[PDB]
Symmetry: C2
Subunit: 639 residues, 2 copies
């Protein structure tokens, strides 16, 4: 930040207060921005500060007054994402309400549920034809035509703002569709756009990289031949998907422009897709490269300057050692992506439900490194994906188990194969290398409700209801944003109508991606003692309690309290108003949990926030019914 930049800035604004705000923000986040661009682009052209600033100034001018207010509000409350009132809902626009206009019609449903974070599945304009479910983007400044237009998106954002809901979008950083304007300008041979991709004249560069790359479709391959470069283009994922070259600063500028464009249309949180892949280095797997963080840090800083209201969420499923970098280590500590996904917690929930054992869970959480306190996990029980058993062999070992043996068990269990399993999932992928399988299926089908409905047995139906509620309780209390997956609140079962639909039939993930039935949702509200109704009212109650428990603030991490019974998981959360201990029984059986381990942190008298009832810990044991969850804090003893 020189005299030059400041004067440029100062002369770019009619109102003096705008100039001052911009300048104060540039002073505050300048360090983050320039240090990072230097580490990536080195001594560059040096013209870059000035070109970046034109992009930032343009975006700031176009930023509407209501979004500037949200901007100041965010500065007053930096931890908005970490507040216990925060509840997320994840849906496909079309499968929830047909169109973006349609989503406006259903805000009463969402606001009623307590949702303050709405993540719609990919909707930026994809190429026509196969599109890797929206990850092949044709234009980032347009919407898929069937869903509406950008205007529609912009309006839906105004409406959501009015009910205090943030809109969340997927932004693919790593590649565009072969039909993207840039990809076309490059094929018509404009040198500028040729430099947006990894382009190769002969078969040598491709060969040099493929030496150390693993493959993502086990189409097979990392490079593709195209007529008008002939020549080779870097194509991680599918052939119609061309990796952008982030070593070219022109690409950086395109993305700061797109992020700020979309932010000005009311996007509040960006899910940054394929972020792990954006930096290539010969000799490596070309994932999780240092430069990835420097770029994220620079993108985040431009967003901090123009649009304080905005936050980033990193989509990378990677081992925990690797994942922690996406929240920031060493220099960065929240200066990169703010949110992420806690894939491990989701895996351990299903694993423990199947194993009736929580040693593995304890171990996985203990080996997880602490996050920066200003960042936040996103927690889910299910999402639009298959489930892969990401259980490391070291974690399994510390639990007295063999990684492969345990993971084979889980696929056997959740597929329905294992004797006396409650689950009804489908196998999605079978890998002949390992034997490792991936499971499709809805929360309700996997937790046993499908199986139980076939028998009619009240006892097994109750077990299924309580399992769904237990899973949702853990994510609601763990610390972080619970991402309810659309229709889990109605306990939707596997849908097999996708087979009759010729475009879905090949891909059985559609099994857990149903159409929302609005009539069914009305039925469930009015039948409180059906299974769905039990889940629906049970969940609405947990969301209400969460929103009023300060100890769930996400800046505080849950610590594992090692359990005297392997059927139980215990989590401690320290807070100024007084500690909380969360107690989960992952078994059908009644557990008599020894008192000492809770007495030690909470004292003699406690009260369960969930049901209201009191417990004495000066008793040898505490009775835990099957699938029972307690949120214990300190209390009294007048009786």
């Amino acid at each position: 930040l020189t005299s030059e930049l400041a004067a440029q800035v100062r002369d770019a604004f009619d109102d003096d207060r705008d100039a001052e705000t911009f300048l104060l923000r540039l002073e505050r986040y300048g360090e983050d921005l320039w240090e990072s661009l230097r580490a990536v682009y080195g001594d560059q052209v040096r013209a870059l500060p000035g070109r970046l600033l034109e992009v930032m100034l343009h975006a700031y001018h176009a930023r509407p007054a209501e979004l500037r207010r949200l901007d100041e509000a965010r500065l007053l409350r930096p931890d908005w994402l970490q507040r216990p009132e925060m509840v997320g809902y994840v849906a496909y626009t079309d499968r929830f309400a047909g169109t973006l206009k349609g989503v406006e019609e259903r805000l009463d449903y969402l606001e009623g549920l307590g949702v303050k974070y709405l993540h719609l599945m990919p909707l930026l304009r994809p190429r026509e034809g196969e599109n890797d479910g929206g990850y092949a983007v044709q234009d980032y400044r347009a919407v898929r035509p069937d869903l509406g237009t950008m205007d529609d998106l912009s309006a839906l954002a105004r409406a959501l703002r009015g009910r205090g809901i943030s809109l969340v979008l997927d932004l693919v950083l790593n590649h565009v569709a072969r039909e993207h304007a840039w990809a076309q300008k490059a094929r018509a041979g404009d040198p500028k756009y040729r430099a947006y991709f990894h382009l190769f004249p002969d078969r040598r560069g491709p060969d040099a990289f493929e030496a150390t790359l693993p493959e993502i479709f086990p189409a097979p391959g990392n490079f593709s031949w195209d007529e008008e470069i002939g020549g080779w283009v870097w194509t991680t994922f599918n052939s119609y998907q061309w990796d952008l070259n982030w070593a070219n600063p022109d690409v950086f500028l395109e993305f700061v422009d797109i992020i700020l464009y979309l932010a000005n249309r009311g996007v509040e949180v960006f899910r940054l897709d394929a972020i792990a892949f954006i930096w290539k280095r010969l000799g490596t797997d070309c994932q999780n490269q240092p430069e990835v963080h420097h770029l994220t840090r620079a993108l985040r800083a431009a967003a901090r300057i123009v649009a304080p209201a905005v936050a980033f969420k990193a989509e990378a499923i990677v081992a925990p050692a690797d994942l922690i970098h996406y929240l920031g280590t060493r220099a960065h500590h929240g200066k990169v992506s703010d949110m992420a996904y806690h894939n491990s917690l989701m895996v351990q929930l299903w694993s423990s439900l199947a194993s009736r054992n929580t040693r593995l869970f304890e171990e996985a959480l203990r080996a997880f490194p602490p996050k920066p306190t200003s960042t936040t996990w996103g927690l889910y029980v299910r999402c639009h994906d298959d489930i892969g058993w990401a259980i490391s062999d070291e974690d399994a070992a510390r639990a007295g188990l063999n990684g492969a043996a345990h993971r084979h068990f889980l696929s056997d269990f959740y597929s329905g194969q294992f004797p006396g399993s409650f689950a009804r999932g489908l196998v999605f992928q079978y890998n002949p290398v390992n034997g490792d399988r991936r499971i499709s299926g809805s929360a309700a089908s996997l937790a046993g409700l499908e199986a139980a409905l076939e028998t009619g047995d009240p006892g097994r139906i109750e077990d299924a209801v309580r399992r769904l509620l237990l899973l949702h309780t853990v994510i609601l209390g763990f610390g972080g944003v619970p991402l309810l997956y659309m229709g889990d609140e109605l306990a939707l079962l596997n849908d097999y109508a996708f087979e009759d639909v010729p475009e879905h039939a090949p891909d059985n993930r559609w099994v857990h991606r149903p159409q929302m039935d609005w009539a069914l949702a009305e039925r469930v509200r009015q039948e409180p003692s059906s299974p769905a109704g039990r889940v629906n009212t049970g969940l609405r109650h947990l969301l209400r309690v969460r929103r009023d428990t300060p100890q769930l603030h996400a800046s505080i991490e849950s610590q594992v309290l090692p359990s005297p019974d392997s059927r139980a998981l215990l989590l401690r959360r320290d807070h100024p108003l007084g500690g909380m201990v969360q107690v989960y029984n992952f078994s059908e059986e009644t557990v008599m949990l020894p008192s000492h381990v809770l007495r030690d942190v909470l004292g003699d008298h406690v009260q369960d926030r969930l049901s209201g009832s009191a417990f004495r810990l000066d008793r040898p044991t505490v009775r835990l019914e099957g699938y029972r969850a307690l949120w214990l804090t300190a209390g009294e003893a007048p009786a």
Copy 2:
């Protein structure tokens, strides 16, 4: 929320102001209204609107420059916690004569690295005896000899330009009997009579005095009694009257608009009376602080509060906020304990007591900040509790008697030259006056001429300053400790000072002497001056000193040494202090286990190889070790 919205929206010609005000009121509204209810009941319901009238007026009058600093503070909430922050404490008159005079010396301060200037009481006191400025006659005026408010305002404009914050003392608990309010009450306006604790006969006063450990005074037109904790010309305000609350929100915002950035809230412990109690540290104190703090958050985000309470540690922590008050009762309190343990360990050559006292200290909210000092305008009282002493293998009172004996000069072969200020005819507990340089042994050493004893004194001063510069929090340099000023024995020649021997450590700044010291690097004062400016430079570049992170005691295998650990994302730091003249051989494993195999002393620049069994630490040496 509805009534405020409309009022607010119309109260502003500019829309952006209205929006900002509203957003801030939503953000800090809970804090404010919840707290006033807990103090005044849901009884007094005109009050939100009266408070808002005060806040809106103040906001309108808030100059553009101070609103910008306001946004800058929101961008960096932790401004007080950055390693860049260094405080300097001085009397206006004794540093540079007048407020105009202080402007002429900013190059001195900015050059030292100072970003926080605390001037001793300067709001207009009563004439005559004034408890050194704690008897305030008008909060909207300055003591006439120092200048005017317009001078204060200009000095703030100059300080802002060098990135220095001005810090003032605001007495919350009482006004001078000559304050306008106290005279309106004597002329019998019922409104102002209600600003004080007033009693018709001696019943009432007697009921209180049962548990207060004079507290009341007779006046002709009040014939009756008024509550007067300190002296008699100092009348306790009645904070149970909301009119008083509003007076102070008005005063705080007024002074904030004149460029005050940090308020030292004086006698805050006393502001709530409750029959049956010592009338100190009452819960209402916190609720009131929280509400004052929220009004300041709304109108003047740039402002912060610092609580002046010397109280046992268990009590002190409430001034930073517990339970629902976490990080709302202050952004700053004094770490009186650390100062006491510095001198104690320097005298004892032993740091067990230090370890114990720090272990018993409870964790602060991470968004708040200690103020740390080696000395200040006060005498020293040995605030060492009997429990702490016990855990160290010491007798509380035995150790306390030693320290007074040592720092007074009485103990045989002590290096200290202090004066006894107060003597208890019961415990025998004494208070000590004296400057850092006199107490650390430099006065004694200059009488001998011995190079070896002079070097020892220089290294003691540097050791003390290093601890406060590395502990986490704002180091409050006391004026002229950087020049190693000795006890001034011309205070007895001053007839106004002679009764009060604290003047011994409250010297006039000699600007010629300051110039001499800059230019004589290997005189004693020059060694201190050079050494200090180097420590300030290193501090300003060590991220691990961010005040949100607390120093933890690493139990030491040698009682001559104190070891402190600080965890941080760029990598941990261990601080090692030797409180003795003798060389200490620390075992290597104790550092290798926290820092790894290769380390660097940030203070001297040299690397350390922990691959040896031991690490040499010369007398009075400090290391700030980090990995690398």
